């Protein structure tokens, strides 16, 4: 019943977090490029283009629906169907979900290793505009996770949602458990009132209404400091009670199953610090960081090699991902001291000159700016 | 060198993995229930049109249970239908007690088993369980057993 990912995403907060916590931090992490003459104009163009929210959304739909499409428009004096000639121009980027892209034309010729690879994409955004056609060079596609080739072909070369059946029903069972816990607390204590002859009441009459009226009234005035009187011969008043214990551990175990199946751990999903240790949560977050780097190396780069060659006129360049670690004003201070001491401790003894020393000191991004020159 | 058994024991499904045959190019006229005998009323373009068994007909096969083709619970008019023409299959019955092993079955109206004293046809295979205040039996269907009268 509860299997529609679209409604489940925007109706359950846990699904929201578990699906979108990753890519947004991925993109906000940052990176840089080597082989470029300068970075100031590079960041100027980047924050003039301001496409990172669209990148976040594209990655989110890729993780959720198993497939998403990204389209870039270039400064070129030809039809949008035509391929792209070499150049470095950009105008804008838009994102579409799995539901708006299809296939038209195939290439299977012998000489090209591109045989069997999609050639022409049929985009049907809807929105009362005519669907149109795009060359392979213009649109890039982001997939979900790997599946068996037999399912890969059955899903026309598109991946699967990260919300599998085990995740869905494990999430669902938690709500049932907490509802049972609330019922358990509600049914902690029950009071019974036994009156011989009470069965002789006529249903839905003044007598029965008055009887239940008086019962509710006398119930509302009882307590520790109040007493109730009864008739020994005809009636009695008993109370029955049951205990509660172990449900905190039970719910904690359910949450632990959720985290183990998800692959994102407690200080990120449950958002409790362990508290019993001083400096193990830093190791926990660096484990999270190594896994996020592992998956980033898989999917974030293709966007970079798809988009960057279209903005930089420079011939050969390289990418590195900034090592994800929270910098402490203080600790970056001491590491800067260490690096400025290492850069010229003993270089004054050999041919290592200022011409490369300045490049070394400004390569590792310092708080010390330096005007270009000799 | 042995044949495996198939555990779920519901009406309309196959009971063994012995040699079987499923004729999947058919369409239904009227409504058919899983586990009933069907008859061939005509042929159009290589497709067989089947209906529930009337009085005086010759049974051809037994409707087969599928969880994609029939989302309602039974087979509906104008639907593609699966029919078992050879093999062991669980059938609805109106009988009260199990007949002799390897006897000859007889089909009442609506495609239910009511006789165990036929002259020729399908045979009892030895399975007899209970369903819904009614019973289920196991029949062995063979391809050329029942021949249409001239």
């Amino acid at each position: 019943a509860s299997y529609h990912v679209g409604s489940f995403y925007n109706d359950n907060a846990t699904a929201k977090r578990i699906v979108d916590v990753i890519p947004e931090e991925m993109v906000t992490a940052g990176f840089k490029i080597s082989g470029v003459k300068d970075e100031k104009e590079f960041k100027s163009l980047w924050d003039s283009y301001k496409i990172d929210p669209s990148l976040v959304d594209a990655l989110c739909w890729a993780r959720l629906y198993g497939g998403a499409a990204i389209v870039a428009i270039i400064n070129d004096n030809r039809m949008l169907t035509s391929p792209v000639k070499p150049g470095a121009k950009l105008e804008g980027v838009r994102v579409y979900d799995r539901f708006a892209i299809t296939i038209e034309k195939r290439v299977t010729n012998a000489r090209s290793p591109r045989y069997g690879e999609p050639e022409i994409y049929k985009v049907s955004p809807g929105d009362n505009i005519q669907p149109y056609l795009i060359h392979h060079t213009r649109i890039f596609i982001a997939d979900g996770e790997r599946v068996t080739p037999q399912m890969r072909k059955q899903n026309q070369g598109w991946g699967a949602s990260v919300l599998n059946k085990s995740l869905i029903d494990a999430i669902c069972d938690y709500d049932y458990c907490e509802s049972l816990a609330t019922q358990i607390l509600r049914r902690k204590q029950q009071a019974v009132w036994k009156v011989k002859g009470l069965a002789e009441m006529c249903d839905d009459d003044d007598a029965q209404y008055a009887a239940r009226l008086r019962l509710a009234q006398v119930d509302d005035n009882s307590g520790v400091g109040r007493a109730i009187g009864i008739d020994a011969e005809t009636e009695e008043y008993d109370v029955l009670n049951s205990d509660i214990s172990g449900v905190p551990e039970f719910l904690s175990s359910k949450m632990d199953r959720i985290v183990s199946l998800s692959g994102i751990h407690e200080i990120i999903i449950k958002n409790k610090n362990v508290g019993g240790v001083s400096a193990s949560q830093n190791t926990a977050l660096e484990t999270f960081y190594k896994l996020v780097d592992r998956k980033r190396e898989e999917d974030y780069r293709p966007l970079l090699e798809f988009l960057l060659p279209f903005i930089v006129d420079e011939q050969e360049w390289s990418i590195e991902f900034e090592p994800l670690s929270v910098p402490s004003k203080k600790e970056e201070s001491e590491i800067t001291k260490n690096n400025v001491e290492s850069v010229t401790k003993a270089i004054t003894e050999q041919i290592i000159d200022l011409e490369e020393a300045r490049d070394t000191l400004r390569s590792i991004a310092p708080e010390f700016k330096l005007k270009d020159g000799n | 060198y042995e044949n495996l058994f198939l555990r779920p024991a519901c009406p309309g499904n196959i009971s063994d993995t012995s040699t079987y045959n499923i004729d999947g190019a058919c369409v239904a006229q009227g409504d058919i229930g899983f586990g009933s005998a069907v008859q061939v009323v005509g042929i159009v373009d290589g497709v067989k049109v089947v209906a529930a068994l009337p009085d005086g007909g010759t049974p051809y096969g037994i409707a087969f249970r599928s969880q994609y083709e029939h989302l309602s619970g039974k087979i509906l008019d104008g639907e593609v239908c699966n029919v078992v023409s050879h093999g062991r299959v669980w059938t609805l019955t109106s009988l009260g007690e199990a007949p002799s092993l390897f006897s000859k079955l007889q089909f009442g109206s609506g495609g239910v088993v009511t006789g165990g004293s036929g002259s020729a046809g399908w045979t009892f295979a030895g399975g007899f369980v209970k369903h819904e205040d009614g019973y289920i039996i196991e029949v062995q269907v063979k391809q050329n057993a029942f021949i249409a009268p001239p």
């Binding site: 299809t102 296939i103 049929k122 049907s124 059955q154 026309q156 | 994609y68």
Partner: protein
């Protein structure tokens, strides 16, 4: 010539077995009023669907 005379769409996945589309309708009217009015005519809408195989 069927596939070249009639248009071809692809808005269905291979595992699909039924589809539906919806249509709408509306009603209403207007009148001439004064400055101190308390009653005004109302409007509404409707809907309908069809199926396939």
């Amino acid at each position: 010539s069927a596939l070249r005379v009639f248009p071809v769409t692809t808005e269905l996945s291979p595992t699909d077995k039924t589809f539906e589309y919806m249509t709408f309708d509306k009603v209403g009217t207007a009148q001439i009023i004064a400055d101190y009015t308390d009653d005004l005519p109302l409007v509404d809408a409707l809907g309908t669907s069809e199926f396939g195989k």
